[PDB]
Symmetry: C2
Subunit: 96 residues, 2 copies
């Protein structure tokens, strides 16, 4: 699997984590082992594959916030549900 | 122009080709005359479908005398229905010109 296909599966994997649980850079960091840098670039590049992401805070604007997938666009969120396990290793994801 | 990034433009190119290939039998020569993209842009785009999980095959008749055509083996993580909805929009951004209409 190529550096671009790796990079691609990464985005779909992060998108998947963000879809089933409220996560921010810190939580994604503790869950995936990826450093803040990688996570931000990954997030910053979601638009390049049609995934629109929002960053949401509580009304009083005192919490650390979470990411929300506004739309998956051309990406099938179903597909990722089926191949979570394959992608897990192919990317080398770690944990607390 | 200011619309989308180069990276995003390149992605929509792959989805657009895949859409074209899925609705009619095409090869490099047919894709070239219809879209205006030169042969290398086509080979390279097709070469990178695997990067986004689209498996494409090139198929011929059994006697292998006819010119082949591309077929999408699987769209994988890509939603084909999405392009259906955004074709006009995407075609504009990519600057696709039906070469026969310009001449």
């Amino acid at each position: 699997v190529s550096k671009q296909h790796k990079a691609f599966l990464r985005k779909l994997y992060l998108a998947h984590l963000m879809d089933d649980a409220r996560h921010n850079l810190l939580s994604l960091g503790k869950l995936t082992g990826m450093p803040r840098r990688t996570l931000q670039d990954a997030i910053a590049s979601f638009a390049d594959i049609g995934i629109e992401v929002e960053f949401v805070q509580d009304g009083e604007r005192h919490n650390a916030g979470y990411y929300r997938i506004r739309t998956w666009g051309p990406i099938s969120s179903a597909w990722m549900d089926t191949h979570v396990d394959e992608v897990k290793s192919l990317l080398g994801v770690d944990d607390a």
